[PDB]
Amino acid sequence: AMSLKDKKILIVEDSKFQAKTIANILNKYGYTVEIALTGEAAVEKVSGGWYPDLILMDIELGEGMDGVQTALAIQQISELPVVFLTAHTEPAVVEKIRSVTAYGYVMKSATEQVLITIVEMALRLYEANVHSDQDSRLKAIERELEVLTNYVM
Amino acid sequence: SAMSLKDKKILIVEDSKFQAKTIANILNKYGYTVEIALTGEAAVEKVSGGWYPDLILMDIELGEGMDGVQTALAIQQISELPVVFLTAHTEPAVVEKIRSVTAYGYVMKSATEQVLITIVEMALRLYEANVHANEGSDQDSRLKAIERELEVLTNYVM
Amino acid sequence: SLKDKKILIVEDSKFQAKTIANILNKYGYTVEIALTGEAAVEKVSGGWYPDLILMDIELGEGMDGVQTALAIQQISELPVVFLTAHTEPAVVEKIRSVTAYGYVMKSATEQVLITIVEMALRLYEANVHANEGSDQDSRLKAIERELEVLTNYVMR
Ligand SMILES: [Ca+2]
Ligand SMILES: [Ca+2]
């Protein structure tokens, strides 16, 4: 239900309170979580060999890199799903998000259920994209079952 | 074949009787079972009474009572039913509220039949994916068991 | 990887169409270009169905991308992903009204475009199989249900 997921999540949120709260919600549904208060922080953490399974990442990070610049810097050294966190959905922000990631965004106001559900869909989408025989196998099963079923008429 | 009996129930939550029936008729044509609630309050009462649709199509604006966002919150405490919002337009203020109460998106009031049915179908399989995943019930883990029993079953011939 | 999936690109600019076509070729998709919506409609009518259409919201002096998408919908269930420069509300509403498969920013990174193409391609295949019954989730429950009655009979 909210069992222990092996997935590691990196939160990139300058706001200490918003960072810690999101970490809390995820922690409580089973995710291993780390925080970075800046996009630069987050790049060092990923280039220092710690590879998350997902990045929740604010489009506003403050006076350094923003979320889009960090998403690209992260892209240079990794092929990790990035899901953006945003306060609002202005066209200028949505364009920026849809142009660096294929994995969408979550409102920082979202209910808890929404956040956790977007994170699972994102992790499952990414696994799907790293990959036929599924059809063949089923076909074998499908007639081997007919093989057997007819015997015990 | 896309019109076949879907074997799925849809709850339209929509105060305009004319709009609700127009959507019910498209959903029936493609083989869905349909229920209409003219208010959010009627919708909450349907589910907390024990009736569970497979998906909700929720207008974000519902007249004098709860609006669609409120309604969606109220149902989120009773079940995790997938809720797809109906909306006239895509102003950031509206899209902001929709995306904070549902992970299943929205459909334009002006969408075509095919866009409606495909969004509904897609939302239904998304939810089935998440429920299956909440339960360890991944399609490949079923494959291991089904093949393993077919071995066992096979050996049973002397 | 080398996919056996063919993508039709409907784009009035030859440079942009060829830019998109190069990227897709570099990842194993068979690609074909229509410079007008009138030509895309004739390919699908003349019986060349692609696996996905990448169509610019805005084309030439003929049909725009939305009208082209609506025509294709009269004769086919093909997945259509719009190319757009700007997600302004009026534009995003037109897009959301004629396709269930979303859009891509002209300025998207190459990884984003590619990923979106794979997702819309997978999604479309699921809907086709589900609507004709041939999806993997269903066929499992068909084997599981008959394998349950088979072994429940052996269990006696
Ligand atoms: Ca911030
Ligand atoms: Ca209304």
Side-chain angles (χ1 to χ4, degrees):
Chain A
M2 8 169 296
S3 312
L4 180 123
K5 340 224 177 308
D6 225 12
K7 316 303 184 180
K8 319 200 284 265
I9 283 165
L10 168 64
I11 300 168
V12 195
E13 184 50 72
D14 45 328
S15 165
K16 261 145 182 208
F17 167 89
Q18 284 178 335
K20 273 289 202 190
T21 309
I22 293 159
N24 262 328
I25 301 165
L26 302 157
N27 242 333
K28 126 200 195 178
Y29 282 86
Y31 295 94
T32 320
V33 183
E34 264 304 330
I35 297 198
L37 305 168
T38 68
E40 302 74 353
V43 170
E44 219 79 290
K45 205 145 180 40
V46 180
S47 94
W50 193 74
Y51 283 83
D53 304 295
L54 198 137
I55 298 192
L56 294 178
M57 157 144 248
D58 201 333
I59 189 111
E60 294 300 295
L61 286 178
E63 287 270 71
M65 314 192 83
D66 60 29
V68 158
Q69 297 169 313
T70 318
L72 288 161
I74 289 279
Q75 186 137 71
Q76 305 188 41
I77 66 185
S78 197
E79 257 281 270
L80 292 181
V82 166
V83 179
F84 276 89
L85 301 157
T86 185
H88 300 289
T89 61
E90 294 302 312
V93 176
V94 160
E95 298 175 31
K96 288 179 171 219
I97 299 180
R98 313 220 187 189
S99 96
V100 306
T101 178
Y103 290 101
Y105 59 89
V106 42
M107 302 312 289
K108 281 136 109 193
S109 55
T111 68
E112 280 182 12
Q113 284 90 340
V114 164
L115 163 61
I116 297 296
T117 299
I118 287 168
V119 178
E120 296 171 359
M121 265 144 51
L123 291 159
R124 293 203 331 259
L125 256 160
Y126 167 99
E127 282 286 286
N129 291 324
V130 199
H131 73 43
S132 302
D133 335 295
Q134 299 283 54
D135 207 316
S136 289
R137 195 186 187 180
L138 274 151
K139 289 212 204 170
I141 291 161
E142 279 169 335
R143 219 285 200 95
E144 181 175 358
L145 186 53
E146 177 63 90
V147 165
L148 312 177
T149 283
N150 184 45
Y151 190 67
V152 223
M153 244 267 253
Chain B
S1 44
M3 328 294 302
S4 51
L5 256 62
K6 284 309 160 76
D7 190 52
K8 302 274 166 175
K9 313 130 244 166
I10 310 295
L11 176 64
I12 303 160
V13 184
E14 170 52 50
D15 55 312
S16 160
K17 260 157 175 268
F18 181 74
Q19 286 172 29
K21 280 175 169 185
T22 303
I23 294 175
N25 260 221
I26 302 174
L27 291 182
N28 272 332
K29 189 158 67 173
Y30 287 85
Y32 286 93
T33 325
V34 176
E35 282 281 317
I36 289 168
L38 302 171
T39 63
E41 291 74 18
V44 179
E45 160 195 73
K46 231 139 192 182
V47 178
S48 67
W51 195 72
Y52 287 90
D54 295 290
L55 177 134
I56 292 173
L57 279 178
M58 179 98 70
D59 195 335
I60 27 82
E61 271 158 34
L62 286 174
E64 270 319 307
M66 267 151 117
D67 68 19
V69 176
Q70 277 147 358
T71 303
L73 270 172
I75 301 195
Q76 195 138 103
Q77 330 294 320
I78 306 165
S79 187
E80 56 166 32
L81 312 158
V83 168
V84 171
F85 280 91
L86 286 165
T87 182
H89 309 286
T90 294
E91 288 321 314
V94 174
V95 171
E96 260 154 50
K97 317 305 181 279
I98 290 173
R99 303 236 186 267
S100 51
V101 282
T102 182
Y104 297 95
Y106 58 96
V107 54
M108 306 309 303
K109 261 140 180 245
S110 71
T112 71
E113 280 196 356
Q114 291 90 345
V115 175
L116 180 60
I117 299 319
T118 299
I119 283 153
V120 171
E121 286 169 7
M122 287 186 321
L124 283 163
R125 284 193 328 260
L126 235 271
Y127 174 85
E128 256 134 44
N130 295 332
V131 164
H132 273 33
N134 284 357
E135 295 163 0
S137 170
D138 63 293
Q139 158 166 142
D140 193 296
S141 293
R142 299 147 70 172
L143 277 176
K144 348 205 170 191
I146 190 179
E147 275 188 299
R148 220 290 188 70
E149 174 66 10
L150 250 81
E151 164 178 34
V152 174
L153 204 49
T154 266
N155 307 351
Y156 174 60
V157 184
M158 52 79 51
Chain C
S1 298
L2 206 163
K3 301 105 176 104
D4 206 59
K5 299 297 193 177
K6 42 158 116 159
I7 299 165
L8 176 62
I9 304 184
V10 190
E11 170 58 57
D12 167 84
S13 159
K14 311 196 204 183
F15 185 70
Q16 290 181 28
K18 291 263 204 169
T19 293
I20 296 175
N22 204 18
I23 289 157
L24 297 176
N25 276 336
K26 260 76 154 85
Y27 290 69
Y29 299 90
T30 282
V31 160
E32 206 148 351
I33 292 183
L35 300 167
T36 70
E38 287 74 16
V41 152
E42 203 203 308
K43 292 185 187 238
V44 179
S45 278
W48 183 80
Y49 291 65
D51 288 304
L52 183 132
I53 298 161
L54 269 185
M55 182 154 46
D56 199 320
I57 206 58
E58 295 176 358
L59 307 168
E61 269 151 349
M63 293 190 279
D64 59 54
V66 169
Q67 298 165 320
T68 298
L70 210 65
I72 281 156
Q73 195 159 101
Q74 297 178 56
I75 70 186
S76 147
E77 304 188 353
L78 285 176
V80 170
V81 175
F82 284 99
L83 299 144
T84 189
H86 295 333
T87 73
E88 312 297 324
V91 172
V92 172
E93 290 165 24
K94 290 161 147 183
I95 291 162
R96 280 183 209 264
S97 276
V98 300
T99 186
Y101 296 84
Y103 63 91
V104 196
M105 306 310 299
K106 260 126 172 281
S107 63
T109 66
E110 175 185 302
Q111 293 88 331
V112 162
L113 165 72
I114 285 307
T115 304
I116 285 177
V117 168
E118 308 190 341
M119 300 187 273
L121 266 171
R122 269 200 289 94
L123 252 165
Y124 173 52
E125 297 182 49
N127 300 326
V128 158
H129 295 348
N131 274 3
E132 78 190 15
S134 79
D135 64 296
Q136 273 44 273
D137 211 78
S138 297
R139 296 199 289 146
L140 282 163
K141 205 156 211 171
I143 318 167
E144 303 168 313
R145 179 81 261 155
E146 202 211 32
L147 179 62
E148 279 189 58
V149 308
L150 178 47
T151 65
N152 199 255
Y153 174 97
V154 183
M155 220 70 170
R156 320 168 173 260

